[PDB]
Amino acid sequence: HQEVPAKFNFASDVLDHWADMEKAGKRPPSPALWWVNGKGKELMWNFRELSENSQQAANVLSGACGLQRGDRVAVVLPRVPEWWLVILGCIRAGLIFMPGTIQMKSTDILYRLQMSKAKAIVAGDEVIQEVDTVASECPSLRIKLLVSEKSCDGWLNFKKLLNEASTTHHCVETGSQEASAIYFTSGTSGLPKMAEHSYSSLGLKAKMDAGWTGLQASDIMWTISDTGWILNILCSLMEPWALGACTFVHLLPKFDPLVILKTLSSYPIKSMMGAPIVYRMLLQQDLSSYKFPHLQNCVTVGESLLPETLENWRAQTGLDIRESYGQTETGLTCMVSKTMKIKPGYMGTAASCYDVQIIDDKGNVLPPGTEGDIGIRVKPIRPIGIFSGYVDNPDKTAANIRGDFWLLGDRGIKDEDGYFQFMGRADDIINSSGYRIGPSEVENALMEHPAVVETAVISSPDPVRGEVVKAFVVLASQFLSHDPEQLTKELQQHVKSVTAPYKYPRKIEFVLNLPKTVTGKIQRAKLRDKEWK
């Protein structure tokens, strides 16, 4: 059960509120999207322009391309304004948007198009070849829209059609619970599932969290993220636009901490969001060379924020980092808001929609100080912000419900004030530098190589990245004579070539056998335990 309005749409109910206010002269034209490429190109839309231009977006998707309410549109773009325009476009036209990363390889993309039966893909120069390799294998795929300075046979020209489109679109009266986005999400075993979010679970939820960061209507916030991750829709797009604030985007084509540091010291960025690894890379630089007195709010999600990282950032910049915690399925689940005291090593308290608790094997709420499983009350009322379920897979959804609670799959402890401390993933999912990696994905990749007869992929402790993907590999005997170091690199290269490179095995150990259950299932937990300390 849920307690929402019957209808909601971020675009008509939030974005267009800010456009009208400018139109009505009740607010001056206020910056919404400020994009830079680092090479001297900058573009800015105020809220009217953002509105007008994304209505153009919607008319491209629904008029030119004929996409219809409920159709699914894959979106694989780098950090260019058109991602924001397209996403808004989908929201207006009632299209289900499915972001992914430009790190994807052809098989990654095939898997998503076939699984989702997408009717459209909106891509850039990065993956176009990749897509063309597999498009003929996707019978539901009708529309291929390319965001590029070049045109290409078989691709519609987004930037041209956009410019040709009307600035008036009639926004669809989308329902609160109606599908708006699918985000593919990795699991403890098997390949990625389709996590479906509603118009409310993203848009209403973000409206209600808006401000936790410390952002005000007149500030600029820079979220540093691949456009594919849910971080992007919630913090780069919805958080600021809920408040009428401006969102900053740097193409940041190579993730360069020095460019980050120069950007912070050259623009009036008030808030920044990024995974802890971003703050760690930044700390490896010489921050004395930079000053950014305008920056006041630094937040993080995706990984545990190390007390030492928190400490050093404070020492080196005079600023706190306020942590938050969540997953694709739940969004922002816990946070340290601007006014809360920071407890090093704790990720904050429940998002305001959520009853978050530590729960036992039978689903009972545990007392403070007791380790258990972290859970969001979803019965009898399902809170605004929880996703709608795994598409086509209600069993897997049912499988993460225990009693009245949805299970995050993380262990934790709750203190006396309701602050949560993360105590580890309870399953085989790997978290490496803020990525959520399914072990089967990396295993299948390795198994394609003739050298690998059997493999198990588990997490390995790493100072810098927290945790890295490690493979245990049983070798085809022919290969026992190869140089190990050479063979390791060959295998690493192989994984990187067939699936998004971020998941490759940074460590590989060759072994004669993998431990198993009497039923013949590999005991990753066993390997994982031995690998830690």
Ligand X SMILES: Nc1ncnc2c1ncn2[C@@H]1O[C@H](COP(=O)(O)O)[C@@H](O)[C@H]1O
Ligand Y SMILES: CCCC(=O)SCCNC(=O)CCNC(=O)[C@@H](O)C(C)(C)COP(=O)(O)OP(=O)(O)OC[C@H]1O[C@@H](n2cnc3c(N)ncnc32)[C@H](O)[C@@H]1OP(=O)(O)O
Binding site, annotated residues for substrate: 328, 436
CB 195 within 8 A of CB 180: no
N-to-C CA span, the chain: 45
Binding residues among 8-67 for ligand Y as defined by CB under 6 A = none
**What is the number of residues in the chain?**
533
Among 108, 130, 410, 467, binds ligand X (CB under 6 A): 410
Whole-number minimum distance, CB 335 to ligand Y, in Å? 10
- In 396-506, at which residue ranges do the beta strands (DSSP E only) sit? 401-402, 405-414, 420-425, 430-432, 435-437, 452-462, 466-475
Q: Does residue 297 bind ligand Y (CB under 6 A)?
A: no
Whole-number minimum distance, CB 223 to ligand Y, in Å? 9
Q: Residue 408 binds which entry of ligand X, ligand Y, none, with Cβ cut-offs from 5 to 8 Å by kind?
A: ligand X
Which CB, 326 or 383, lies closer to ligand X?
326
Q: Residue 442 binds which entry of ligand X, ligand Y, none, with Cβ cut-offs from 5 to 8 Å by kind?
A: none
Concatenating the DSSP letter of every residue in 211-271 gives TTT---TT-EEEE---TTSHHIIIIIIIHHHHHT-EEEEE--SS--HHHHHHHHHHS---E
Q: Does residue 496 bind ligand Y (CB under 6 A)?
A: yes
Cα→Cα distances 459→229, 393, 500, Å:
21, 27, 17
Q: Give me the half-sphere count of Cα atoms (radius 13 Å) on the Cβ side of residue 4.
A: 28
Q: Does residue 65 bind ligand X (CB under 6 A)?
A: no
Angstrom distance (rounded) from CA 28 to CA 221: 19
Which CB, 219 or 428, lies closer to ligand X?
428
Which CB, 55 or 185, lies closer to ligand Y?
185
Q: Does residue 278 bind ligand Y (CB under 6 A)?
A: yes
Which CB, 98 or 347, lies closer to ligand X?
347
Q: Does residue 277 bind ligand Y (CB under 6 A)?
A: yes
User: How many contiguous H segments (helices) and E segments (strands) does the chain have?
Assistant: 18, 27
- In 393-439, at which residue ranges do the beta strands (DSSP E only) sit? 401-402, 405-414, 420-425, 430-432, 435-437
Show the binding pattern over residues 273-302: x = contacts ligand X (CB under 6 A), - = does not. ----------------------------xx
Q: Does residue 347 bind ligand X (CB under 6 A)?
A: yes
Which CB, 10 or 325, lies closer to ligand X?
325
Q: Is the peptide bond before 380 cis (omega within 30 degrees of 0)?
A: yes
Q: Is the dihedral of CA 369, 370, 372, 378 positive or negative?
A: negative
Using CB under 6 A, list all residues that contact ligand X.
185, 230, 301-304, 323, 325-328, 347, 408-410, 422, 425, 431, 436
Using CB under 6 A, list all residues that contact ligand Y.
103, 225, 229-231, 255, 275, 277-278, 301-302, 326-327, 331-332, 433-435, 496, 501-502
